Ligand binder design. Structure first.
Ligand SMILES: NC(=O)C1=CN([C@@H]2O[C@H](COP(=O)(O)OP(=O)(O)OC[C@H]3O[C@@H](n4cnc5c(N)ncnc54)[C@H](OP(=O)(O)O)[C@@H]3O)[C@@H](O)[C@H]2O)C=CC1
Ligand SMILES: COC1=C(C)C(=O)C2=C(C1=O)[C@H](CNC(=O)[C@H](C)N)N1C[C@@H]3Cc4cc(C)c(OC)c(O)c4[C@H]([C@@H]1C2)N3C
Length: 177
């Protein structure tokens, strides 16, 4: 069917942000020309899913430039949060299965991009709803920070592809189960 994919950038110790929710280690790093183009991945996406912390990061850091206007967007939270009334943004909560079929439908046969973050990704994985991961790994350790996938127990994956870029960053596709 349609794939729920976790496409994310992470440190070598498996963190997707500093403990203060900063991405200096990420944004200050030049992936290089030989990286897989962002567009080529985003072309395969028909919906995005997010937790509320990642939503608030994007709105505080790019308030006038929502990046996913091209697709519907589902933000999970237990608040009655509000989006600018002009943006394709829905707020859902609870069981991760219902959210996935809602998002897979809206994706129209394209994939659902689980942008994150960790807590949200783990909710889906614990529910057996996460099917693939695409990780860009930055050659750095930050010691502590936001965990990429805080699952409750060991989630094993099959390595389906891996590239090492000229800059030291790496890319891999992981299939769940
Ligand atoms: N480096 C990268 O490539 C990426 C980095 N990031 C970073 O990750 C950080 C945040 O990741 P994280 O800290 O894991 O927080 P999340 O982004 O996972 O948001 C977590 C929140 O989502 C809500 N939520 C999750 N599951 C459910 C559910 N089943 N039902 C209802 N609400 C739910 C809750 O919000 P509430 O409290 O509202 O209930 C929870 O606190 C941010 O700093 C972001 O910038 C994000 C994506 C990729
Ligand atoms: C592949 O390597 C990745 C690198 C090198 C990255 O910089 C980033 C990622 C990578 O995967 C991925 C997604 N890739 C993306 O290209 C877009 C930004 N979504 N990201 C997910 C998001 C959403 C977002 C949004 C905005 C507006 C950001 O402002 C720039 C931003 O930094 C971020 C980021 C981060 C950026 N978090 C919060």
């Amino acid at each position: 069917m349609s794939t729920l994919v976790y496409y994310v950038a992470a440190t070598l110790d498996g963190y997707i942000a500093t403990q203060q929710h900063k991405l200096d280690w990420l944004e200050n790093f030049a992936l290089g020309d030989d990286a897989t183009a962002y567009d080529d991945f985003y072309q395969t996406i028909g919906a995005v899913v997010m937790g509320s912390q990642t939503y608030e990061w994007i709105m505080s850091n790019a308030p006038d430039d929502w990046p996913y206007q091209d697709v519907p967007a589902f933000v999970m939270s237990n608040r009655d949060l509000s989006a600018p009334a002009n943006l394709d943004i829905t707020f859902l909560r609870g069981d991760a299965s219902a959210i996935a079929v809602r998002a897979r439908q809206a994706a129209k046969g394209k994939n659902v991009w689980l942008v994150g973050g960790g807590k949200t990704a783990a909710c889906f994985a614990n529910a057996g709803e996460l099917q693939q991961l695409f990780i860009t790994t930055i050659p750095t350790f930050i010691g502590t920070g936001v965990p990429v996938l805080p699952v409750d127990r060991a989630l094993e994956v099959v390595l389906r592809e891996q590239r090492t870029l000229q800059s030291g960053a790496m890319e891999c596709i992981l299939d769940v189960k």
